[PDB]
Amino acid sequence: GPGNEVTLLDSRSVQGELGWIASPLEGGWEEVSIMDEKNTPIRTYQVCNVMEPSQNNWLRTDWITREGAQRVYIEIKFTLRDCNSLPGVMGTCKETFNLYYYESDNDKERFIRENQFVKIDTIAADESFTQVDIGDRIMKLNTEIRDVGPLSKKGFYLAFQDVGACIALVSVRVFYKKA
Amino acid sequence: XPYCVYRXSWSC
């Protein structure tokens, strides 16, 4: 449990805007706040350009220290709209997104090339869900976890690539397990 | 787009 985990990043516990780096800067991944019962914002990132072709929208975290862990765990809570629930002809609509990482000793990288990112997985809605009670509503979200390693630079960046889905990333947590 | 935005529920 949390007792044996050390959190490296938790998007839910960041104060103020996440300000993660989106490419394109506008019109792709955008920050959307969902207000919880205490009027604290849940900072989500969303993109839904299902009506436009050739989507390649990237979103990357800031630098995340690995603190001497070689194996980290990435937990994402998200929701997608199924293509069959979106009216309109959408020949290129997708229901997945891609997850990547890039290791670096440099905590202030800018414009990391697409080809520097290493793919972790294609993420889809699968069997596993969680419920997040926010007062007026209970968010029923897919929950997926992936391990990454072995890591060997001082830290890393995580990235999410959309290629034409209708996706909301509601929570991203990265942790390691401490012996 | 965004064609839809997720708020509690999706709205499109």
mmCIF file of C-alpha atoms in Angstrom:
data_model
loop_
_atom_site.group_PDB
_atom_site.id
_atom_site.type_symbol
_atom_site.label_atom_id
_atom_site.label_comp_id
_atom_site.label_asym_id
_atom_site.label_seq_id
_atom_site.Cartn_x
_atom_site.Cartn_y
_atom_site.Cartn_z
ATOM 1 C CA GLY A 1 0.000 0.000 0.000
ATOM 2 C CA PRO A 2 0.915 3.711 0.203
ATOM 3 C CA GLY A 3 3.190 2.826 3.153
ATOM 4 C CA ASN A 4 5.606 0.979 0.857
ATOM 5 C CA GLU A 5 5.226 3.361 -2.105
ATOM 6 C CA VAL A 6 7.082 6.537 -2.679
ATOM 7 C CA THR A 7 5.269 8.973 -4.945
ATOM 8 C CA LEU A 8 7.348 10.650 -7.655
ATOM 9 C CA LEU A 9 4.489 12.540 -9.396
ATOM 10 C CA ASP A 10 0.827 12.893 -8.601
ATOM 11 C CA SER A 11 -1.152 15.212 -10.859
ATOM 12 C CA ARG A 12 -3.929 15.358 -8.264
ATOM 13 C CA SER A 13 -1.676 16.915 -5.632
ATOM 14 C CA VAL A 14 -0.144 19.676 -7.782
ATOM 15 C CA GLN A 15 -1.112 23.207 -6.674
ATOM 16 C CA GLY A 16 -2.186 25.420 -9.573
ATOM 17 C CA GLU A 17 -2.059 24.571 -13.261
ATOM 18 C CA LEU A 18 -0.068 21.562 -14.329
ATOM 19 C CA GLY A 19 1.419 23.583 -17.237
ATOM 20 C CA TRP A 20 2.759 20.413 -18.819
ATOM 21 C CA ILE A 21 4.135 20.941 -22.294
ATOM 22 C CA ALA A 22 1.697 20.336 -25.167
ATOM 23 C CA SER A 23 2.709 20.025 -28.817
ATOM 24 C CA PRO A 24 0.797 21.554 -30.522
ATOM 25 C CA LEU A 25 0.598 24.276 -27.894
ATOM 26 C CA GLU A 26 -3.006 25.081 -28.812
ATOM 27 C CA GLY A 27 -5.856 23.019 -30.184
ATOM 28 C CA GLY A 28 -4.510 19.613 -29.096
ATOM 29 C CA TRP A 29 -4.172 18.576 -25.449
ATOM 30 C CA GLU A 30 -5.679 21.223 -23.166
ATOM 31 C CA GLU A 31 -6.100 21.619 -19.410
ATOM 32 C CA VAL A 32 -9.694 21.296 -18.150
ATOM 33 C CA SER A 33 -10.608 21.718 -14.492
ATOM 34 C CA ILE A 34 -13.332 19.640 -12.882
ATOM 35 C CA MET A 35 -14.335 21.139 -9.548
ATOM 36 C CA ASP A 36 -14.646 18.751 -6.589
ATOM 37 C CA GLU A 37 -17.100 19.199 -3.664
ATOM 38 C CA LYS A 38 -14.738 21.616 -1.867
ATOM 39 C CA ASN A 39 -14.237 23.566 -5.097
ATOM 40 C CA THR A 40 -10.706 22.292 -5.512
ATOM 41 C CA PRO A 41 -9.866 21.769 -9.164
ATOM 42 C CA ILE A 42 -9.174 18.303 -10.524
ATOM 43 C CA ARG A 43 -6.658 19.139 -13.223
ATOM 44 C CA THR A 44 -7.392 17.038 -16.269
ATOM 45 C CA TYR A 45 -5.903 17.057 -19.762
ATOM 46 C CA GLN A 46 -8.189 16.427 -22.700
ATOM 47 C CA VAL A 47 -8.166 16.214 -26.452
ATOM 48 C CA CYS A 48 -10.992 15.277 -28.830
ATOM 49 C CA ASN A 49 -10.171 16.180 -32.428
ATOM 50 C CA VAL A 50 -12.119 13.224 -33.744
ATOM 51 C CA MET A 51 -13.475 15.237 -36.691
ATOM 52 C CA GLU A 52 -9.984 16.141 -38.044
ATOM 53 C CA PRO A 53 -7.484 13.843 -39.784
ATOM 54 C CA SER A 54 -3.832 13.041 -39.076
ATOM 55 C CA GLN A 55 -3.807 13.805 -35.351
ATOM 56 C CA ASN A 56 -0.491 13.681 -33.577
ATOM 57 C CA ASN A 57 -0.965 15.513 -30.327
ATOM 58 C CA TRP A 58 1.708 15.237 -27.676
ATOM 59 C CA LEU A 59 1.666 16.098 -24.005
ATOM 60 C CA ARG A 60 4.672 15.743 -21.739
ATOM 61 C CA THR A 61 5.210 16.016 -18.060
ATOM 62 C CA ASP A 62 7.862 18.060 -16.454
ATOM 63 C CA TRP A 63 11.010 16.220 -15.381
ATOM 64 C CA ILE A 64 10.417 13.510 -12.750
ATOM 65 C CA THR A 65 13.292 12.417 -10.472
ATOM 66 C CA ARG A 66 13.633 8.639 -10.131
ATOM 67 C CA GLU A 67 15.296 8.933 -6.668
ATOM 68 C CA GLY A 68 17.496 5.823 -7.184
ATOM 69 C CA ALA A 69 14.534 3.563 -8.167
ATOM 70 C CA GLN A 70 15.174 1.536 -11.368
ATOM 71 C CA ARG A 71 11.561 0.400 -11.730
ATOM 72 C CA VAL A 72 8.652 2.807 -11.516
ATOM 73 C CA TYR A 73 4.932 2.362 -11.791
ATOM 74 C CA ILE A 74 2.599 4.642 -13.710
ATOM 75 C CA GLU A 75 -1.110 4.680 -12.761
ATOM 76 C CA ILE A 76 -3.504 6.543 -15.007
ATOM 77 C CA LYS A 77 -7.177 7.224 -14.476
ATOM 78 C CA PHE A 78 -8.939 8.247 -17.658
ATOM 79 C CA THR A 79 -12.066 8.150 -19.723
ATOM 80 C CA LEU A 80 -12.681 7.936 -23.454
ATOM 81 C CA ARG A 81 -15.740 8.360 -25.587
ATOM 82 C CA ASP A 82 -16.266 5.304 -27.800
ATOM 83 C CA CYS A 83 -16.244 6.200 -31.486
ATOM 84 C CA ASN A 84 -19.631 4.536 -31.912
ATOM 85 C CA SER A 85 -21.082 7.023 -29.366
ATOM 86 C CA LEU A 86 -19.915 10.059 -31.365
ATOM 87 C CA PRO A 87 -22.162 10.998 -34.234
ATOM 88 C CA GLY A 88 -20.553 11.976 -37.479
ATOM 89 C CA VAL A 89 -18.655 9.961 -39.994
ATOM 90 C CA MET A 90 -15.203 9.505 -38.375
ATOM 91 C CA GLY A 91 -13.073 7.214 -40.486
ATOM 92 C CA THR A 92 -9.986 7.799 -38.354
ATOM 93 C CA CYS A 93 -11.524 7.858 -34.839
ATOM 94 C CA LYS A 94 -9.469 5.945 -32.244
ATOM 95 C CA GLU A 95 -10.092 4.644 -28.725
ATOM 96 C CA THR A 96 -6.546 4.371 -27.469
ATOM 97 C CA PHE A 97 -3.642 6.660 -26.650
ATOM 98 C CA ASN A 98 0.119 5.969 -26.514
ATOM 99 C CA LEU A 99 2.306 6.309 -23.461
ATOM 100 C CA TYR A 100 6.065 7.009 -23.622
ATOM 101 C CA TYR A 101 9.059 7.960 -21.536
ATOM 102 C CA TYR A 102 12.419 9.664 -22.071
ATOM 103 C CA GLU A 103 15.232 9.427 -19.556
ATOM 104 C CA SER A 104 17.441 12.425 -18.908
ATOM 105 C CA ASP A 105 19.902 13.934 -16.470
ATOM 106 C CA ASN A 106 18.603 17.354 -17.638
ATOM 107 C CA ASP A 107 15.676 18.591 -15.646
ATOM 108 C CA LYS A 108 14.971 21.530 -17.969
ATOM 109 C CA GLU A 109 14.829 19.897 -21.400
ATOM 110 C CA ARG A 110 12.992 21.705 -24.126
ATOM 111 C CA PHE A 111 11.679 20.425 -27.435
ATOM 112 C CA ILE A 112 12.509 16.753 -26.939
ATOM 113 C CA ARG A 113 12.157 15.065 -30.346
ATOM 114 C CA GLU A 114 9.389 12.505 -30.928
ATOM 115 C CA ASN A 115 12.032 9.950 -31.786
ATOM 116 C CA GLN A 116 13.720 10.348 -28.388
ATOM 117 C CA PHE A 117 10.623 8.964 -26.623
ATOM 118 C CA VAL A 118 10.469 5.239 -25.866
ATOM 119 C CA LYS A 119 7.049 3.596 -26.110
ATOM 120 C CA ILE A 120 5.686 1.963 -22.923
ATOM 121 C CA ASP A 121 2.340 0.840 -24.328
ATOM 122 C CA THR A 122 -0.811 1.617 -26.227
ATOM 123 C CA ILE A 123 -3.410 2.316 -23.529
ATOM 124 C CA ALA A 124 -7.043 1.331 -24.002
ATOM 125 C CA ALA A 125 -10.159 1.151 -21.861
ATOM 126 C CA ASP A 126 -9.970 -2.407 -20.651
ATOM 127 C CA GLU A 127 -11.596 -4.212 -17.733
ATOM 128 C CA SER A 128 -10.413 -2.188 -14.815
ATOM 129 C CA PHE A 129 -12.164 0.849 -13.438
ATOM 130 C CA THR A 130 -12.264 3.054 -10.395
ATOM 131 C CA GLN A 131 -14.943 5.339 -8.939
ATOM 132 C CA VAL A 132 -14.024 8.817 -7.752
ATOM 133 C CA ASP A 133 -16.708 10.483 -5.650
ATOM 134 C CA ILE A 134 -16.510 14.261 -6.245
ATOM 135 C CA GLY A 135 -19.809 15.240 -4.526
ATOM 136 C CA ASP A 136 -22.360 15.931 -7.277
ATOM 137 C CA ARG A 137 -21.094 12.989 -9.359
ATOM 138 C CA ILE A 138 -19.110 9.818 -9.084
ATOM 139 C CA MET A 139 -16.566 9.654 -11.902
ATOM 140 C CA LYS A 140 -16.381 6.148 -13.315
ATOM 141 C CA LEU A 141 -12.918 6.014 -14.829
ATOM 142 C CA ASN A 142 -10.732 3.411 -16.446
ATOM 143 C CA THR A 143 -7.652 2.726 -14.380
ATOM 144 C CA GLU A 144 -4.482 1.286 -15.874
ATOM 145 C CA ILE A 145 -1.033 0.680 -14.405
ATOM 146 C CA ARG A 146 2.244 0.008 -16.216
ATOM 147 C CA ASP A 147 5.763 -0.569 -14.939
ATOM 148 C CA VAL A 148 8.822 0.953 -16.593
ATOM 149 C CA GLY A 149 12.446 0.077 -16.177
ATOM 150 C CA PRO A 150 15.250 -0.352 -15.699
ATOM 151 C CA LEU A 151 15.954 3.398 -15.426
ATOM 152 C CA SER A 152 19.459 4.803 -15.133
ATOM 153 C CA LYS A 153 19.475 8.609 -15.568
ATOM 154 C CA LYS A 154 18.728 11.091 -12.859
ATOM 155 C CA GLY A 155 15.100 11.350 -13.980
ATOM 156 C CA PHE A 156 12.668 11.061 -16.852
ATOM 157 C CA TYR A 157 9.781 12.660 -18.708
ATOM 158 C CA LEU A 158 6.505 10.926 -19.447
ATOM 159 C CA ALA A 159 4.530 11.648 -22.611
ATOM 160 C CA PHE A 160 1.089 10.930 -23.946
ATOM 161 C CA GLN A 161 0.330 10.863 -27.659
ATOM 162 C CA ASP A 162 -3.114 11.188 -29.101
ATOM 163 C CA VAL A 163 -3.701 10.054 -32.656
ATOM 164 C CA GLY A 164 -7.394 10.845 -32.912
ATOM 165 C CA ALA A 165 -9.310 9.777 -29.817
ATOM 166 C CA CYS A 166 -11.695 11.585 -27.461
ATOM 167 C CA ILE A 167 -9.762 11.252 -24.261
ATOM 168 C CA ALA A 168 -9.644 12.796 -20.777
ATOM 169 C CA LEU A 169 -6.637 12.022 -18.555
ATOM 170 C CA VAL A 170 -8.023 12.650 -15.109
ATOM 171 C CA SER A 171 -5.110 11.491 -12.859
ATOM 172 C CA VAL A 172 -1.517 10.486 -13.433
ATOM 173 C CA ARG A 173 0.519 9.070 -10.575
ATOM 174 C CA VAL A 174 4.055 7.724 -10.781
ATOM 175 C CA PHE A 175 5.644 5.839 -7.848
ATOM 176 C CA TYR A 176 8.269 3.381 -6.844
ATOM 177 C CA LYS A 177 8.288 0.590 -4.272
ATOM 178 C CA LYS A 178 10.666 1.093 -1.414
ATOM 179 C CA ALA A 179 12.519 -1.860 0.116
ATOM 180 C CA UNK B 1 -12.666 20.057 -31.743
ATOM 181 C CA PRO B 2 -12.952 19.488 -28.962
ATOM 182 C CA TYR B 3 -16.063 17.733 -30.123
ATOM 183 C CA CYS B 4 -16.771 16.694 -26.508
ATOM 184 C CA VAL B 5 -15.459 17.722 -23.107
ATOM 185 C CA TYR B 6 -15.457 15.602 -19.950
ATOM 186 C CA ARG B 7 -16.944 17.437 -17.024
ATOM 187 C CA UNK B 8 -18.794 14.342 -14.356
ATOM 188 C CA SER B 9 -20.063 13.331 -17.796
ATOM 189 C CA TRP B 10 -18.968 13.766 -21.328
ATOM 190 C CA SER B 11 -20.851 16.456 -23.235
ATOM 191 C CA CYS B 12 -20.582 16.709 -26.996
#
